[PDB]
Amino acid sequence: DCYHGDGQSYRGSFSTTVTGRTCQSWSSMTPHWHQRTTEYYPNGGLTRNYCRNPDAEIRPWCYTMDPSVRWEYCNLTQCPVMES
Amino acid sequence: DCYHGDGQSYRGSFSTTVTGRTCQSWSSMTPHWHQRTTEYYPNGGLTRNYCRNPDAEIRPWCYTMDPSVRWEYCNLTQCPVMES
Ligand SMILES: O=C(Nc1cccc(C[C@H](C(=O)O)[C@H]2CCNC2)c1)Nc1cccc(C[C@H](C(=O)O)[C@H]2CCNC2)c1
Ligand SMILES: [Mg+2]
Ligand SMILES: [Mg+2]
């Protein structure tokens, strides 16, 4: 599993962070209150707790289930790019 | 005590909400995490837990100490305006 571009188009089910924390569901406000929901970002693919990039960070990310860690980049790398 | 204009200029010590809740200190991330701190909004007068309006809401406001109520308008009204 990997993302293309900056990962705005990523639509897989990867849901864990670079430090092995569990992503929080986008629809949930717990533990972290936020405004990155599917209503606010309808083009973001914000479903379940899957890594996404609705607001054009540099790569896919999520809020985390650790109350002390608001959000992290997900443990995904960019897919091999087209080479000449 | 009262505010002028939309209350961006309010610099008094009123610190309670329209429902009688206590304002959270601007520098604190508890109970509510936020980005309305004096470093982000240096022109906002964000000190202690006093009602302010750093981001041009319609009137002064604060985050609250009730974990279930993120922010409210403060219990302040507009000062009597200049009449012709
Ligand atoms: O938040 C933002 N703009 C905002 C606009 C209108 C209302 C509000 C809501 C304000 C509150 O409840 O704090 C109210 C209070 C009264 N006045 C407005 C916030 N923008 C924002 C910009 C950059 C970064 C972030 C943090 C964001 C996050 O950590 O959630 C990250 C996550 C990964 N990508 C970004 C947020
Ligand atoms: Mg790479
Ligand atoms: Mg009035």
Residue numbers in the entry:
A (entry chain B), B (entry chain A): 0 to 83
Authors' description from the paper:
Lipoprotein(a) (Lp(a)), an independent, causal cardiovascular risk factor, is a lipoprotein particle that is formed by the interaction of a low-density lipoprotein (LDL) particle and apolipoprotein(a) (apo(a)). Lp(a) is a lipoprotein particle that is formed by a two-step process involving interactions between a LDL particle and another protein, apo(a). The goal of our research was to develop a potent and selective orally delivered small-molecule therapeutic to inhibit the formation of Lp(a) by blocking the first interaction between apo(a) and apoB to reduce the circulating levels of Lp(a). In summary, we report the discovery and optimization of potent and selective small-molecule inhibitors of Lp(a) formation by exploiting the repeated KIV domain structure of apo(a) through compound multivalency.
The linkage of two molecules that contain the crucial LSN3353871 KIV domain interaction motif created a dimeric molecule, LSN3441732. This dimeric compound inhibits the formation of Lp(a) particles in vitro with an IC50 value of 0.18 nM (n = 8), representing an increase in potency of three orders of magnitude compared with the parent monomeric molecule, LSN3353871 (IC50 = 1.69 µM; n = 43) and two orders of magnitude compared with an optimized monomeric ligand, LSN3374443 (IC50 = 36 nM; n = 3). In direct binding assays, 3H-LSN3374443 bound to full-length recombinant apo(a) with a mean Kd value of 2.6 nM and an approximate maximum saturable binding (Bmax) value of 9.8 fmol ng−1 apo(a), equivalent to two to three ligands per molecule of apo(a). In comparison, 3H-LSN3441732 bound to full-length apo(a) with a 50-fold affinity increase of Kd = 0.05 nM and with Bmax = 4.9 fmol ng−1 apo(a), indicative of one ligand per molecule of apo(a). Notably, as observed with the monomeric compound LSN3353871, binding of LSN3441732 to KIV2 was ruled out using ITC. In Lp(a) transgenic mice, LSN3441732 plasma concentrations increased in a dose-dependent manner and steady-state plasma Lp(a) levels decreased after five days of oral BID dosing, with an ED50 of 4 mg kg−1 and a mean maximal inhibition of 79% at the 30 mg kg−1 dose. In cynomolgus monkeys, 2 mg kg−1 and 10 mg kg−1 oral BID doses of LSN3441732 decreased median Lp(a) levels by a maximum of 45% and 57%, respectively, after 5 days of dosing, and continued to suppress the steady-state levels of Lp(a) for 14 days. Compatible with a multivalent binding mechanism, LSN3441732 showed improvements in potency and efficacy both in vitro and in vivo compared with the monovalent inhibitor.
